[PDB]
Structures are given as C-alpha cells and as structure tokens.
Amino acid sequence: FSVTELSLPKGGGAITGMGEALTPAGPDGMAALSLPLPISAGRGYAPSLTLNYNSGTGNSPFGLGWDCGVMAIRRRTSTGVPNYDETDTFLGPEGEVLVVALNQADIRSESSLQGINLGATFTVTCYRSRLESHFNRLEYWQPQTTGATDFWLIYSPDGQVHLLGKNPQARISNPLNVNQTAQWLLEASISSHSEQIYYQYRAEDEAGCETDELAAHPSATVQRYLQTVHYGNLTASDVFPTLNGDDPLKSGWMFCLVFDYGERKNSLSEMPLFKATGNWLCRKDRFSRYEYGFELRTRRLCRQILMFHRLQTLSGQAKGDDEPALVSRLILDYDENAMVSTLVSVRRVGHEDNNTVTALPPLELAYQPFEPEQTALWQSMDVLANFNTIQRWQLLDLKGEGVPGILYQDRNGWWYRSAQRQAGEEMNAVTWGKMQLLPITPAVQDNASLMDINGDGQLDWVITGPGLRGYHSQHPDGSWTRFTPLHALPIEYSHPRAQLADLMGAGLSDLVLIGPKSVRLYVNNRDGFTEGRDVVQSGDITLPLPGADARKLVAFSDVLGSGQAHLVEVSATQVTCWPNLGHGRFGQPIVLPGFSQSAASFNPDRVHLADLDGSGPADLIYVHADRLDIFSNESGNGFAKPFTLSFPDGLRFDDTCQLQVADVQGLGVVSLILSVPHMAPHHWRCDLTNAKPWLLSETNNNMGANHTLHYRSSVQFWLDEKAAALATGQTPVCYLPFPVHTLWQTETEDEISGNKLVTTLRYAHGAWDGREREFRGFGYVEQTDSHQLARTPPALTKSWYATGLPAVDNALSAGYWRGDKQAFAGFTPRFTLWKEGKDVPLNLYWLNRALKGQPLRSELYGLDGSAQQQIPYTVTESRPQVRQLQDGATVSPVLWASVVESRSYHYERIISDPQCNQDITLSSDLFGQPLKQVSVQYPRRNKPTTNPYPDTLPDTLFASSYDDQQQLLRLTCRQSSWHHLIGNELRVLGLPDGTRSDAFTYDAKQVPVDGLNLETLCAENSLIADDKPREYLNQQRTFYTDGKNQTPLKTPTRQALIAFTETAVLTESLLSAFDGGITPDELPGILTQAGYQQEPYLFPRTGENKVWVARQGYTDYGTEAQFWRPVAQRNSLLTGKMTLKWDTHYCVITQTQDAAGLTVSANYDWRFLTPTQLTDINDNVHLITLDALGRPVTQRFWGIESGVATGYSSSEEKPFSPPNDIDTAINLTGPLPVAQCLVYAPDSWMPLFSQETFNTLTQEEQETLRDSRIITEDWRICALTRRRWLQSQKISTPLVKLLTNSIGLPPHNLTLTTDRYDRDSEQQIRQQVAFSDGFGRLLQASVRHEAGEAWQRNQDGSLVTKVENTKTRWAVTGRTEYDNKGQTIRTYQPYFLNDWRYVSDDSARKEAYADTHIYDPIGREIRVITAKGWLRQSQYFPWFTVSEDENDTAA
Amino acid sequence: SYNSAIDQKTPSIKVLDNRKLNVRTLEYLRTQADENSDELITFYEFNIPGFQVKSTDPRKNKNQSGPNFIRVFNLAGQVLREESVDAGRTITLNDIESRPVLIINATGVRQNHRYEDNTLPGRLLAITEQVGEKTTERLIWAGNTPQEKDYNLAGQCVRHYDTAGLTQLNSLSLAGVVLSQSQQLLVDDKNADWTGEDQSLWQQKLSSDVYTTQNKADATGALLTQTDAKGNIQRLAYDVAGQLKGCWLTLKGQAEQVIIKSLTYSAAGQKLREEHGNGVITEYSYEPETQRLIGIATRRPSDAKVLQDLRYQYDPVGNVINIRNDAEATRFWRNQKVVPENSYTYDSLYQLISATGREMANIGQQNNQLPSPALPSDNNTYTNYTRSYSYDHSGNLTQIRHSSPATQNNYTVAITLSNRSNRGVLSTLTTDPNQVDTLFDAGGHQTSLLPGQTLIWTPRGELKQVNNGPGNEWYRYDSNGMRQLKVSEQPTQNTTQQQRVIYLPGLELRTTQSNATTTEELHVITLGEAGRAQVRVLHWESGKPEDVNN
Amino acid sequence: APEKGKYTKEVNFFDE
C-alpha cells in the first residue's frame, strides 16, 4: 500500500543499455537471449511481447533463431499431419498438450458470451493442460450450426480473458477448406479492470516477389504476420471488441505498437509515419512449412518495431480520431543471403521535433559463418581399416550413444567398434576402438535389417521372414530384447518396389508403393502397420517412380527444409520436388533451378542429397573423378553456383567407390567420407567447417561489453563421460541417441576495465524419452565461473536436475558429495493422488514425465587448490512431488508438479559442524496455493573432540562458540487461506485473505537421524500436531471491497479490490508490558483511542479469543467507467483521506489533494506519460523538459517567495536548449535560465569516424566500409563488425591503421547545475561529467573545481602524476573498478585532473593508489588490501564470523 | 613507534545461532605486550519470534548479576518496555501509524502526543507531560491561504510553542530554506503550560523581546548571507564546486570587513588552505593513501612565524599515537622554546592506556575549575606530565594516574562504579560500590556533581539547575533539547548578581545585571561552526572594560 | 555519536 506522491523524474548518471540479457544455462542446453521491446505501458495493460533468441529455433519473420510472437492454440503436428476431426489433440500456448477437463467431460451448450448473442449455439468444451503450471482453463467453442465458426477462450488466473481466433484475420486455416483451422491466433484480451488489447494481423500476399516465386507458390495467402497491436482502451468495456461485429478499431485506442515489414522508411533520419507510403518487402530466404497439410509460406521479415501514441487524444482535445504520432522506434537490421537471414543489429532511435535524431548505440549480433569454399580440409582416414560397403560393414550407432560406430556382421557373430575419445592432444578428438565381438545376437540372420521400426530411439533387428514377422530391440546397456512380434504387417512389405518413408509426418517409417497417379500408404502406428489406403493425386500431378530410370534419381529427401520427406527427382538438367502434404498426398511440383551437369557424364548414383550446414534444406553433391561439385540449397528455392573441392593427391573415384555423409566428429556438422575399396580399403574425410553454422557467436552493446559464445555437441559430453567411466571400471550407458548442440562456454568481457569472466559449462546424463519422442534435458549441469582480471579461484557449481527417465534419475544420487557421514537422508520424488480435497499417496509413466526440469541437488565449490577444495561451500537438496488432478484412461492425466520440501546446508568448507535448515510444504489446495508451511531450523551438532577452525584463531574460540541458542530445533508453522473465484465467465485465483504464523521449539534430542520430513510432520503424533504448545507470532487478514459499499465482502469480486489489511500487533499476554505507568483499567480505552481493535484469532484454538489488530491501508476506488481506479486513500482511520484525481482517460494522476486542502497538480508529457510540470503546495511551478528518448533535460522553477515573483524565467521568456556536444556545453558561460541541464552521450564508446576522412579513401574502399556495416549513418564505428573485419584483412592499408587505434570514452553524461537564478549576474555553473560502465554500473564522476594544481592526463588516456597549474581543473570523485559480476574490486582515492575525460584503467592501476578487494564464491569480501599496504581480513564459518582490521594483520 | 604485539591474535568474533542472529560477540583484550589476551564475551539473548530481548556486557556476566537491558516487544518488533540498568524503564506506546502516543520514562513522567482529528491529515498538535498536568508543547499549523503561499508557508508549523517559548516561522524559500524566523523566550517566573485555545494569554508568559533573524539563499538552497537578531550581517560566497570560499561580516552601522578571504580544498573536499582577514594562513596536510589529517600548519606571513605546526601520526587503524609541534613556545613561557612531543598508546580494544604531554607548573591537581592564566609578566614555564588510564571490562574509565615528575604532583583519581550498572561517580563522593546508584535518578541522570553540589533535572531528562552552595545556575531548552538560555545567579552581595546568556542563530546575548540595572551587555557575533576554526566578535553595547577595545 | 576528527565533514555555517 502506497499513498500516491507526484514527483518529477531526475536525470540519473547510470547509462543503462537496451536491456539484453543472456539466460543462465540449465538442463535444456541451448543458448538463449532476451531483448525487451519498447512497449509504452500507458494505462497499465500492455502486451508482453519481447524478442527472444534460442539456439535451436528455426527460421522466422525475425531472422533465424529470433522470435517475437504472441500466444496461440494450434493442433498438435508432432504426432503427424492433423485429421481435423474429433480424434485430434491440441497444443496450448505453453507448448503442452491439452486434454478435456473432467468435473464426466465439461460439455455445455451456450449461445451467449458476455451478454452478446453470437447468432448460433456453440458446444463449449473446457480444456486443461496435461502438465499444470499456470492453472488457466481453455474453452473450445465450436458451432453446431453450419454457418458460424469455431474459436477459443483462455481464462488466465489473474482475471484476464483471451479471445483466440474468432475472425479469419486471426486464424491460420486451410486455403481450400476454410473450416480446417490449424492455428487460432490471439485476437483480443480483456483485463479485470475493463482494459482491452486488440491484435491486428495481416495476410501474406504476392507483393514484391518475382514470377519464379509466383509460379511455384501461387496462392500463398495463409501465413499471418502480427501487424499492429491496439491497446489503450478509450472507454471501459468488459466485452470483446469484435464479438458485436462492428469494426473493432472504430472503437478508440490511444496506443499502437506497429510491427513494420518494409513499408516505411528504414533510414536513421526519416521518422517513419503511421500510415505508409509503400508496401512490404519480399525477402531472400523465403522458406516454407508443410506440417499442417498445407503450405505456410512466410515471405517477410520485420524491419522496424514502432510505438505510436494518439497525442491529441491523451490531451483532452481529440477523441481518438487523430493520426498517431511516433514516440519509440526499434531498427532491426539483417544480413540477407538467400539461405538464412540473421538479425545482426537492433537500435533504438528517438526523433526530436526539430528534425534531429536521439539514438542509442546499437546492439549488434554476430553469427557463426558457413564458408565451406575456404575452410574445406581433407584428412586421411586410416582409422576405418577394411571398411567396405561391398561387404557387410556399416557406419551406424548401436548402443544408442549418438555417434556412429563401425559394425561388421557375419552370419554367426557381429563385430563392433564403438566411438571413443583419443586421449592424445585435442579435447574433441574422436577415434574408434578395437573390433569387439558382440556377446549376443538375435539368432535369425535371414530376411532382416537394422531399423527403428517403432521410433523409440533404440534400434531393432526387424525379422520379416516367411513364417514369422517381428523384431528384437537393442537396449543401450548391451542387452538385446527378445522376439517381439509385429501386430500387423502388410503383405506388400515384401514387394520389390515398396519402400519405407515418412509420409504421415509422425516421424515414423510408413510403407508406401508409389504409383504415377495413386500411392498405396500403410501407416506405421508404432505396433506394426494399419489398413492400406489408395491416395489419388489431384490435378495434373504425375509422381516420379523410384528406380524405374537409370538417368534420374528419384528419392525421398528434404530439399525444402520443412522437416518432411518430399519427393525429389534429380535429372541431369533440373531438380523437381513434389511437396509431401501428409496422408499420402503430394502437392504440385516445384522446380529448383541451379543444378546442371553434362547429360552424357551424369550418373545419378554419384548424386548425394545431404544437408551440410544445418539450415535445413539438403545440399546437392555430385561426385566426379578428382573433384567434387557442391550445390548449396538456397532455402528450398534453388541451388547456388557450384564450388569444387579437388581430391587430394592419390584419390580418385569410380563405380566401386562410395561417398558417405555422417557426423563422425561430434562437431555438429556432417563430414563427407569417401571410400575406395580396391587393393586395400582406404578412406578420406572432408571437414567443411569447424563449428555448426548460423548459431549466435558474439554480441555487443557498443558501450564496452561483449559476450562470445562457444558451443559443444552433446556427443562430446558423452565421450568424455564414457571415457572417465571406463577409467574406474564402471560401465557407462547413454540415453541420448541424438546429438544436442549445447552451449559450452560464454565468455564475457568488459572492454573498458579489461576484466573477463569465462563461464564454462559441462553436461552429463542426457535423457531422450522414447514414448513421447521428446528430449527431456540433461540431469547434470556444471558451471565454472573463472574470472580473468587484468589469483581469484574459480567457483564450480555442480547441480543435478530430474530428467523424468527412471533409468537416469536413479543414477544421479550416486554422484553426490557424501563427505560428512552425518547428513540427513536424501529425498525421493513423491507421487500423490488427489481425491476428497487432500493429497493421498500412490500411469506411472506420466508421473515420472512431470518431473522434468525439477531441481534435485546443487553443491557449490571453490577451486583454489587447497585442502578444502573438495568440500562444498553449501549444499541444497530438493524434493519434487506430483499430484494427479484427473485420471487419464487412453489420454494423459492432468498432473501438477512442484517442489514440496527443500533442505539447504551451509558447510563453509567445514565437513563437520554445518548450519542446516529446511522449508516444507504440507498442504496445498485445488490450485496449488500453500495451506500449511513449515520452516525448520536445525540445531547445532554436538561439540566434537577434534576441532575444525584451525590454529590461527585463538584457542578459546572453539569452546566459546557454543551458545544455548544454537541448540534449539525451531519450527515455524504457517497456515494460509485463499479466495478462488470460479465461474463460467470467472477465473480469479490466488487471492489471499488470511495467514498466521506459529512457533514450535524443542531441544536437540527431538530431531531424529534421517531428519525431519513431510512424512514425519504430517503424522498423528508429530511435532506440529495440535497437542503441543505453540507460540503466536503474527496474523494478517486481507479485506476486500466491491468498490462502492463500506461493508467488506465475504467473497471478493473479479476486480479484487483491497479495502484494507488487518495485522495483529498486540495480544493479551503482551499487555503486561504496561505495568508501572498504565493502569489496567484504562489501557483498553487508551488502545482503542490509538486505532486498535479487538478481533478474533484467525484459525483459532481453545484458549484464545481476541487480539489487538492494526487495521490500516485504506483505499476508495472508482466505478467501472473510471477503470476501478483509486480516488481516495488513507493510511488508517486515525488520519484524513487523501483524494486523488485523474485525467480524462484515467491513466495518470493529475492533482492529488491532501486532507487539509493542500494540492499538488501535475501536467504530463504524453509521449512517455511522464510528469513534466509540478505545481507544489505553495503554487511554485517546477517545469522539466524531456528529450526524444524520454530522458530529462533542462529544468526550471519559479514562484512567489517573499510576496514577490522570483525564480528562473520561463521558457516563453528566455528560451534555451543545451548543445548536443558535451564539450561545447562545458564552454557555456553566462546566466542560464535553467536549474539543471543534461547532455547525454551513450554513443561515446563507439569512436567517431569523420565524414572529412571518409571521402578521402576510394569509392569501393567506401562501400566495403558501409556494406559490412562498420560505419553507422550518424558516423560511428561498430565494434563487432570492425573486429570481425580486422581478421580477414591482415595487410595494413591506412583504413586498417585508422580503425585499430581509434578509441572513445565510456558512456557518459553531463549535468550543468547553476547556483543562482538567471538575471542575477553572479550565477556560476557547476559542471559534472558522470561515466558509466556499459553494464549499467557507475564508474566515476568528474566535478569541475576552481583553477589550481592537478595531475595531467595524456592525449591517449594515461595519467601523469606531477602537479601543474591548470585553468580547467576537475576532481575525480568515487572512481570504481568492477569485475564482470558487479563486485567492486578497486576503490580509488580522489585526485585532481586537468581534463574531464576518462583516464585509462591500465594507467589508473599503476598510479592513483586504491584499495583492492578480494572475494569468495559466495560474494562476500574475504580480505581488502588498503592503498598504503595494510590489509583487513574476514573469515566466514557457519556459526561465527571472524574479523581482523589493519592492526590485527600488521603482526 | 607503534607496537603490534598488543594486537596479535586479537580478532573480533560475532557468534551466530541457527537463525543467523548475533548471540555473542567476542573481544580479546591485551593491555601490555608480554601478557596474554583476555576473552570478553558480550551476550545477546533472543526470544522465539527473533527480537533481542536481553543483552549482557562481559563484566556483569562475571558478577552473575542480571542483563543490562530487558526488552519487551510487540508482534511487529517495536519495543513496548525497555528496562535498562543504566537508563531505567521506558514504556512506549505507538498508534497504527507508528506515531508516539504514550511515553513513560523512568522518573514516572507520562508524555502524551495528541494529533489532529480524522478529518485532518493527522499532524502533531500538542504534547502533555503529566507528573500535575502540563501542555508543554503546542504546534500551530498553517493553511493554503494565498497570503501563506506568497511566503511558502503552506503546510508548515508557523507558531511552535515549546519548553522555552515561541519559535515563529515567517518566510520560506522555493527550496524550503527558512529565510526569516523569530523567537521569544519564556520569562523566568513561568514554565511552559500552553493550555487553552486563545493565544493572547500565551503572550503574557513570553518576553517582550522578539528576536527575528533573516537569511538569503541561492537556488541550490545554500545559505548566502545571514542577518543576526541585532542587524550584523554575515555573507558567504561559494565556488564552482559548491564549497565555501569566502566570508564577510558587516556590523550594524559599520562597513564590510573580511573574515575569510580564501578557502581552497583538496580532492576529497577536505580543507586545504585558508587565509583569514586576520592575514594568518593555515594549511592542512593529508595522507595521500588514506586521506587522514597529518598536519595543521598555522603560519603568519608578516613575521614568517609558524604559530603552530601539529604533525599527527597514526596506527594502521587510525588511532592518533604521536602529535609533535614543530613551532616554538609562545611569548607567555620565558626561557624555553621547544614544545614536547605527545605520545599515546592503546589497548587491544583501542582505548587510551597512556598519554604524555605538557602542562603548567602552578596547575596543581585537576578538578572542575580551570587554572589561572599564564600572563606575559609572571615568567612561568611548563613541565612534562604523563597520564595512565585503567579500565574495567565494561569500558568504564576507573582510574587516571597522573604522574608528573620534576614538580612532585603525583596523584591518582578513581571512579567508583556500581556492580549492576555502569553508573560510577568520582571517589570523592562515594568509595562504596553499593551506594553509587543512590547518587543518580531513576532515569540514570546524576543528581550530585560534587560533594557540595546538586543537580536538578527536567521531566524530559535535561539539566535544569546546577545548585552550588550559595549560587545556582539554571538553563532552558527547546523542543529538540538544545540550550536556549543560561542564567547564572550569584549570591547576595547586597542583592542578586545575575548573568544571562541568550543563544540565537549566530548571536549570543551575554548580559550581566544587578538588582535594577544592567551592568554589562555583550553581543557575541559568531561566524561558523565551533570546532571548525570559528571566529567570534565581542561587541559591547554597555559596560565595556577599560583596557579591551570594542 | 563518536565520530572522527572534524576535518572529514563538509562545512556548515547555519543549521538547527
């Protein structure tokens, strides 16, 4: 509760950036990054759209990896192409599968939503997530009448209701069958306070694309782009803006977040308008997607993200009909190269009204390149001796394990070579072991092959002989499963022209017989096959036949990148592709130009379709003798110019030779393996690249901070785990059969201070689930924060997570630190069933699947190479539980997973004597709110004879460390009560109305071995049962109002308006504190005069009747037309009501008024909704001015002081604006009419290339400086594109020498504060420059002083420490050097300087004496060496802390 | 000359419980280098909700007497009762908005605070100190009349009646700096009892003299100039860093002289060089590394004379261990011109164990009086002394052993302390440790200064009177507790002999009067902060001495 | 409260 006080924004000195942040790495392995969009949250209800990178996300309208999208409900296409009937499942917005919610199923018949007649009668079906996290409910409205359409509602628990895909502008549907909807996009939202958001989408069109695009993809008008988002509800209504069917933006809006796709101008200095002069741009990597049964095209990229305000509406002049003016602008730059577009530069630009630009330094992003023409290396392969495709050899992986081995198979025994680690030289060196004889083989070697017939990850030996048909599966722990018979096999499985392909889209190998105009499809259903169809191909589609020509290659390949097996025909002239549409259907053929060979010398057996980089489409390799043509697929739209990779000396090809493409390196990218079998099998490997391309490598904010990201494959994290297991004689088993390309090292560098921090990651225990066919994550992640200051030991943090796979989860607890032999018993997961409103303990597969991503343990270490290096600083263990909320017969249950008790230790690298505690949840209600919580403090362990805490401490410290207050088992119970608002149009959960804390204390002979846990404290004679004495601590009871009645409600309304809050402060035992001085007869009259009231106990027991409470925090709210805004709030009934007041549209407080009549008016700058004029209680005006980014500049004040009018003169009287140059504003003299000025300069770390030097160098030397984006168009040097350009050059032109020694100051600002008012001739201007760190932190400040002696700064940034007389003297106060984690590691004494500019850190470390600070892994300060040479010291033990000053360490 | 054998293996340990509350703090005390350190354990006890109920210093833990403090809290953690062993018992009640309602101190004095009603913002109105019922304070708030807004008086306490009279506020600047205020004093025969509603019967308890003072301030709210209550104007100037660089005084009816003509500063804003209108230049030297004051060099640039030059030396921790003066002895001490070195040593707890220096020859034993001055005619010298101090484990100074050779005045003086309290008096009063707490109030204020002197205290624990034998001396304080009056009433010659001092902003009205007439009236004009090289101007309106100049 | 020498603090000619 806060009483509203209007104030003005002050101009701070911490130059913060755009807000980008790399996500901490966890069990998923990927590298993520967030970037906040500049959404002007005007009234309080704004969209939550942000830009998010994920290394693993495919292509998008925001580049590769990036995605700024709004939530939607779509059909599940991981189990194949949807059938669009009653036998289909849906994915929620969180990505989890929805199930029908049972009460029988929630099916009701409705014709009215929010009072509005819909025109038809709908079959509303309440859905529910099958892994409950948010507890929101989802209604599938579908019409019974033919003529309407279906939509969704989402009732989020914070009172919001969403409308997803009601109108066809927000539905991705089949362009032929308009009822076949595949994606219900979010259309509108209502908050609880009648605030509305409306989402406007645009369809794809044939704009700006050539005729080769329009021939292959004719009617591509299905893919939607979020065009603009309307919010700022001009009048309050709880109904949706398009239910009534009356033009949803004919209602007024005040804020518009416009996404621009190329329509408006994208230069720095043009100020793009609301309505656009032109049309959007058709990009270069126009990809396509076929997972829905039709083609999604995605032809556009998003150039700008704009923010608009209706400024004449917010001021009480217009009523929503004016043109919205620009207030905020992002500029997204891409490197388009017709394979992928990558977002390389994001910049926020503000535009001033005097046709100038306020710009921030751009966030620029660098990606791992795919240049296989230069980096192609040929290496001999003698590891694979006698490998041969003519005989019975194979590059495949048994045992799971993700990297291919070498299998030779005789008819009696099989010989294997598992991939392993070379111990010699490189951290990623892979070789193959001995030929090992396999101990068991499935004994039916005839009519069989190795394939995954059921798709559960482990390979099968599928024996389809004359009498039997079935398979043996290969477990990863070496064992072979016995014979499992296939439930149904087609008779045409033994047809000579049938083949196993993936047509239904479910990731399974279906059986297909391709005819020219009709295929026969047998669907794999994971236990055999199903009844065969005859899918007749539409139109003029005549399918190619595989094998029926020797001059063509007809195979199943993904030459479009969609993730489907399309039908490709490689002739000697062209490559024609028929897109797979699922269910046996095939689309119209697409010609991919660019491939051509000599028609005589073309043999299709040398044609190999393989994806080389990993962008998704398959590249085309044609093999000659002595060279190797490679055609790069350009997003499935054609092939590039070929490039040759000439064979090394001694390698030629023929019809006996073979080209294999495989990932035999663990580098994420496939390698080309050429085999020559005659007179000895000898082999060669082509490695095209080192790293996996198009992943985010480097980022930079151009303020002195950059991050470099390095990736490692999970195959390498398995080969290191497998090699270390066989060193201790254990047998390692891998449960991740596929490579996951994980983030491994993310080095951070502050370019100002030179400090680096290298966080290296290490993964183990990857888990892939075979049943749901999903990656479950890793079960063991390491971090190693090692600092590189320009010593301190690295901080290793082991941390285990639950995978959900029970073979991986039962192996985790054998890797923990045991160490102390007195710790309590570790936790196991708690599977629990929910019936009759309580958790009763216990589809065991779904219960374990809910445990994914739960924390299990974490141990923190400090690697200093000491005798305590192996002992952890702290140990935290957790216990997850899973509650089954509704049962699932053939569908999944609804499960709710949470951590039910967490126990933490504090060893401080002392094995005995830790400080342990625990926090247990006992009860939760229907929606997961806690009903009974217990906090456990554990006593100190008994005094051992051997002591730790070594001899440097005083001898009596160990015995004097034991108080009698460390040896009490303290339990703090905590009961809670909640309000859950449930209705057909109502879902508001988690409203508090009561909490109460009690205390239990026992001696140390009551804490048992194996500890306390949930199964102890919930028992019948437990330590918190209602038979034991408890001590009261406090209680709190929230009271709610309906908005207009003085009596509080028993059950709150949807708006959840808090009337007051009631906190107990005095009990009848505590009234004996007034004994000598207050008569007991008069105390209840004194207490009720001080505002106390007597209320009953909250969850009352026998023997307690009243407490003296403090009922406070009052608020009076408005009506529904005033958006339920507070209009008058007081602190308690003792003081007076403070009446607030709002503007015409109830978004900002103008003129709050006190209880005495004291008034504080405020005017607002409607570009940012920022108060820029404050009239205080004595009618003195305080006027500030903002720049285009919203930051404050010049402020004045005036008023009446001694009966006369005084102060600074107004802007209309003496008009002044400070210069945009910081050094020019230093030279400002004379009476300024303002109290402050502010000249910001965050661009300063980018060195300024001059236009007078840019036209000196030559013209094609100019465009390489621009097309590489090294200079900006306001003449600034980008640090990331310069550093990448200073690698390939390596010979020093004058452009090279000019770029490598250019420099700038840290991002600073200048504040000019004046002493006296203007028209007073004695006014002098105090000057202050404040430098920032580039991480948002504050480096130093330069305060201007009078003329006198000062050290001089050199012309490069050094410090000369001989004093000299100076007319421009500056005092450097509060100079600080940080590490990368924010801890202060230097504190400088102040010193006088002859300049305001920043002195370099290498020169401030030599001279300019400071105190260096040393830290530990926790973050506390171990010692500090002072500037003179003495040092203080601190030691942190779990039960006592030891401090030593400069006198204790002097001896 | 610092010996670090005092501080070896003596750290400070804060022992924690299982809630990470500081339940013991541990100190190690070594007074002299050869012996062993002594562990001192201070005990802090906490209840189950986690508030510090009782605390015990290491000396009373050895006595097996009770704790120093016994606190009783409410459910929010605020103290409702505080039975201190030195300050007695305090019963405190606050309302819902955490404003004080009822305070009972250890002398049994109930203090009230009544506020505005529930229709008003709830500002403070009156304070009642019931002992038998006195409305001792009365606050008059202002409104938002356009006459009030012209002087920025809206929402301020314009008239504030307190324990010494009235403090009326007249004008505020646009920053909030008071530009004009006035104050009258209560007459000698009246105490503050501001009962009632009309204020016309409160002016008949106040003096006739209304002392108004005026200021002028810049836009940054720093005080530029100040007129005193008599008309003497101080005027300050500020440099470009916001620091103070000059000072000018113009007495009433006179021209403008210079008091400070230059004042420069260091990089950390410490004073560096200052030249007065005296002409004397003082210069401060600092440590480069630690920025500690290592020199005060007062130089007169007319005789090339260094009047004093104090060079300080320190411990590593910042304890002054050596002051030497590189100046010569002044004109008052004939036949000697070397100032001795002051050396100091400390314990492990950094408390002063020994101290050397210079003292006069005819000083005798130290007491409450100050010795007679050394005139430039009586050719007296100074001698060397050394004092050694002794403490108990509560940190009370128990013994000063002044040993001055070459004069044979070797005396010790003991402070006799209690067993349960830190209340300790001089050994002249009582030699018994059990009759020390009979010499104090219930609130712990001392009631007898010397054997023939008694002290009287206010309801709010301020010194009301130092009763000597024949001549008392009483004081008056405002609502903050700052002294506004000091009236020394000497005994009967043929009538009373009364000396009155009025403390005003930048002005002391020291006056001396007999029965019917004022025999001396002195207006001391002060310039600056005391302890920060203050300048005083003694202006005589009546009863000037013959030999001094005005 | 016991603070250090007077040189550490900023100048102050007029307060209450």
SS (H, E, C) A58-104: CEEECEECEECCCCEEEECCCCCCCCCCCCCCEECCCCCEEEECECC
What is the token pair recorded at A561? 């990148």
Q: What CA–CA distance (Å, rounded) separates B347 from B40? A: 13
In the three-class reduction of DSSP (H, G, I as helix; E, B as strand; rest coil), residue B5 is classed as helix
**How far apart are the CA of A1383 and the nearest CA of chain B, in angstroms?**
22
**Stretch 1-16 of chain C: residues touching chain B, C-beta under 8 Å:** 4-8, 10-14, 16
Q: What phi-psi label fits residue A227: left (phi over 0), alpha (psi between -120 and 50 degrees) or beta? A: alpha
Cβ neighbours around A1074 below 10 Å, total: 23
Chain A residue at shortest CA distance from B19: A937
A569 vs A188, A560, A566, A629, A1064, CA distance in Å? Answer: 46, 13, 10, 18, 80
Write down the number of H helices and E strands in chain B. 2, 38
Substitution target from A1079, A1178, A1204 for chain B, most B beta carbons within 10 A: A1178
**Stretch 358-397 of chain B: residues touching chain A, C-beta under 8 Å:** none
**Stretch 168-207 of chain B: residues touching chain A, C-beta under 8 Å:** 171-174, 179
- Degrees, nearest 5: CA angle C11-C12-C14: 160
Substitution target from B532, B534, B535, B536 for chain C, most C beta carbons within 10 A: B532
Contact at 8 Å (CB) between A1277 and A1249? yes
**Stretch 3-32 of chain B: residues touching chain A, C-beta under 8 Å:** 4-21, 23-24, 26, 28
> Are residues B97 and A1111, on separate chains, in Cβ contact within 8 Å?
no
Contact at 8 Å (CB) between B331 and B318? no
**How far apart are the CA of A1057 and the nearest CA of chain B, in angstroms?**
22
- Which of C7, C12, C14 is nearest residue B226 as measured by Cβ atoms? C14
Q: What CA–CA distance (Å, rounded) separates B122 from A303? A: 57
Substitution target from A903, A941, A963, A1195 for chain B, most B beta carbons within 10 A: A963
Number of domains in chain B: 1
Residue located via tokens 């505002």: A1091
A294 vs A302, A561, A733, A1362, CA distance in Å? Answer: 24, 15, 41, 78
Which residue range(s) make up the domain with B36? 1-550
Q: What CA–CA distance (Å, rounded) separates A391 from A172? A: 51
Q: What CA–CA distance (Å, rounded) separates A92 from A135? A: 12
CB contacts, 8 Å: C5 with chain B: 293
B217: buried, middle or exposed (CB in 10 Å: 19+, 13-18, 0-12)? buried
> Are residues B24 and A963, on separate chains, in Cβ contact within 8 Å?
yes
CB contacts, 8 Å: B264 with chain A: 1346, 1348
Q: What CA–CA distance (Å, rounded) separates B395 from A1163? A: 60
Helices of type H across A1293-1439: 1294-1300, 1401-1406
Q: What phi-psi label fits residue A1319: left (phi over 0), alpha (psi between -120 and 50 degrees) or beta? A: left
Contact at 8 Å (CB) between A541 and A590? no
Contact at 8 Å (CB) between A476 and A735? yes
User: What does the DSSP 8-state code read for residue A1236?
Assistant: E
Q: Which of A760, A764, A665, A761 is nearest to A717 (CA)?
A: A764
What is the token pair recorded at A696? 């985010």
Handedness of CA A378, A380, A385, A388 (dihedral sign): positive
Q: Which of B26, B73, B65, B70 is nearest to B45 (CA)?
A: B70
- Which of B2, B72, B75 is nearest residue A1067 as measured by Cβ atoms? B75
Could you list the beta-strand ranges (E) of A1135-1191.
Answer: 1138-1139, 1152-1153, 1159-1165, 1170-1175, 1181-1186
A758 vs A55, A795, A1031, A1233, B513, CA distance in Å? Answer: 19, 11, 50, 50, 82
Residue A756 CB contacts under 8 Å (≥ 6 apart), including other chains: A747, A748, A749, A750, A787, A788, A789, A790, A1380
User: What does the DSSP 8-state code read for residue A239?
Assistant: S
Report resolution (Å) to 1 decimal. 2.9
CB contacts, 8 Å: B150 with chain A: 1200, 1202-1203
Residue located via tokens 């070379």: A422
> Are residues A1344 and B240, on separate chains, in Cβ contact within 8 Å?
yes
| Long-range contacts, A1441-1445 (Cβ 8 Å, 24+) | A1441/B13, A1441/B14, A1441/B16, A1442/A953, A1442/A957, A1442/B11, A1442/B12, A1442/B13, A1443/B11, A1443/B12, A1443/B13, A1443/B14, A1444/B11, A1444/B12, A1445/B316, A1445/B317
**How far apart are the CA of C3 and the nearest CA of chain B, in angstroms?**
12
Cα A608 from chain centroid?
38
Helices of type H across A662-736: 714-725
B454: buried, middle or exposed (CB in 10 Å: 19+, 13-18, 0-12)? middle
Residue B3 CB contacts under 8 Å (≥ 6 apart), including other chains: B33, B345
- Which one-letter amino acid corresponds to residue B229? A
B47 vs A1024, B7, B43, B84, CA distance in Å? Answer: 19, 35, 13, 17
Q: What CA–CA distance (Å, rounded) separates B14 from A1441? A: 5
What is the token pair recorded at A939? 């006593």
Contact at 8 Å (CB) between B498 and B521? no
A819 vs A823, A864, A875, A1098, B17, CA distance in Å? Answer: 9, 19, 11, 45, 24
Contact at 8 Å (CB) between B339 and B345? no
Residue located via tokens 């217990």: A934
Contact at 8 Å (CB) between B62 and B56? no
Contact at 8 Å (CB) between A225 and A72? no
Helices of type H across B229-288: none
Contact at 8 Å (CB) between A854 and A899? yes
Helices of type H across A1191-1293: 1222-1226, 1251-1254, 1259-1266, 1279-1288
Q: Which of A1257, A1262, A1266, A1259 is nearest to A1294 (CA)?
A: A1257
> Are residues B270 and C8, on separate chains, in Cβ contact within 8 Å?
yes
Q: Which residues on adjacent β-strands are paired with residue B257?
A: B249
Substitution target from B145, B240, B314 for chain A, most A beta carbons within 10 A: B240
